[PDB]
Design a protein around this ligand. Structure first.
Ligand SMILES: Cc1cc(NC(=O)c2cccc(-n3cc(NC(=O)Nc4ccccc4Cl)cn3)c2)ccn1
Length: 342
């Protein structure tokens, strides 16, 4: 009689439409609170994400709203597409939770990165990331925060980007919740507050690709201080022309850091990290190292574009505005509610 039922999945209560059966937590890789379930109507397995009081603060509200709007005007095989959106609450006054429903995947990209993958698999995952990223840019979305934990994969190696990245406006306001933001995949133009173009996302692809090879986060650190140190110790101090594009205060800090020549790409990614069993693999290792050297480039003006990355020999084998202004709790609640109601 009631269209919904509630079930305990870990520490969270999931109140879902009765079509969704056998809820099981994914736990990792995901994210917020995400369940696997059987959709009896579509006779297919789904993933269900619960957004708990998304209007509770400015940060959760901006992201919930922006992603609800974009998950509607984006249509691509390598970008999340929603099967359903619902709230168990009947009125705006009663409104609390948003549930998002998508195709159930098999792993997040962090798990895949931990595997010893062949060149076929590595090049195929990278091509899809580049394809999804190309789609976003054509829609006028520049991600800026692409990271493995918001990327999921199926057993057949098909890939999907689950989020839309950083807000147009800022400045990444505090989060009074026990969770940390992963910043290791952010481009120098993001680390140093610089201004950017489409290829800001190429750096993130390079960090993901390097980690697949190395099996260690390329640029770790407590925050941006430590992180920038990791970037300059490995790639070398950037050229004077890149530094003439930084804000005065940021420029001062960067130029006053000790100088590093930077390790060469064969030293940053030796042959021993790649299969050396055949001629086919010897060429694929040199092609992968060449693409890494074009992607992990501090200056964006000298960094490879999405289109040129797609045409790169390691990759091309696979070729076949509203509303970020300040709002109160009540305003965000209504804006989110009407998008949930469409
Ligand atoms: C055949 C099979 C596969 C299983 N899959 C996993 O265990 C697994 C592991 C890791 C990840 C995933 N995954 C995570 C997502 N979605 C989201 O993370 N978020 C999200 C969700 C809904 C709407 C919107 C968003 Cl953003 C999708 N699949 C599944 C489990 C059991 N059986």
């Amino acid at each position: 009689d009631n269209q919904f039922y509630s079930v305990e999945v870990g520490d969270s209560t999931f109140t879902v439409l009765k079509r969704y059966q056998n809820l099981k937590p994914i736990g990792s890789g995901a994210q917020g609170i995400v369940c696997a379930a059987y959709d009896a109507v579509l006779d297919r397995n789904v993933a269900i994400k619960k957004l708990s009081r998304p209007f509770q603060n400015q940060t959760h509200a901006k992201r919930a709203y922006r992603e609800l709007v974009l998950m509607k005007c984006v249509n691509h095989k390598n970008i999340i597409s929603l099967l359903n959106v619902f709230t168990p609450q009947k009125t705006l006054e009663e409104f609390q939770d948003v549930y998002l429903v998508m195709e159930l995947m098999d792993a997040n990209l962090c798990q895949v990165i931990q595997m010893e993958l062949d060149h076929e698999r590595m090049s195929y995952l990278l091509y899809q990331m580049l394809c999804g990223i190309k789609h976003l840019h054509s829609a006028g979305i520049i991600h800026r925060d692409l990271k493995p934990s918001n990327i999921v994969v199926k057993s057949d190696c098909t890939l999907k980007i689950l989020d839309f990245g950083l807000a147009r406006t800022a400045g990444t306001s505090f989060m009074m919740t026990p969770y940390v933001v992963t910043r290791y995949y952010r481009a120098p133009e993001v680390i140093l507050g610089m201004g950017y173009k489409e290829n800001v996302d190429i750096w993130s692809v390079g960090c993901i690709m390097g980690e697949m090879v190395r099996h260690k986060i390329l640029f770790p650190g407590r925050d941006y201080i430590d992180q920038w140190n990791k970037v300059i110790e490995q790639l070398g101090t950037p050229c004077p022309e890149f530094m003439k594009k930084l804000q005065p205060t940021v420029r001062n800090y960067v130029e006053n850091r000790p100088k590093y020549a930077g390790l060469t790409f064969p030293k940053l990614f030796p042959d021993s990290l790649f299969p050396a069993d055949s001629e086919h693999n010897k060429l694929k290792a040199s092609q992968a190292r060449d693409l890494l050297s074009k992607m992990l480039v501090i200056d964006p003006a000298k960094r490879i574009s999405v289109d040129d990355a797609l045409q790169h020999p390691y990759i091309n084998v696979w070729y076949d505005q509203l509303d970020e202004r300040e709002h109160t709790i009540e305003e965000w609640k209504e804006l989110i509610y009407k998008e949930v109601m469409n």
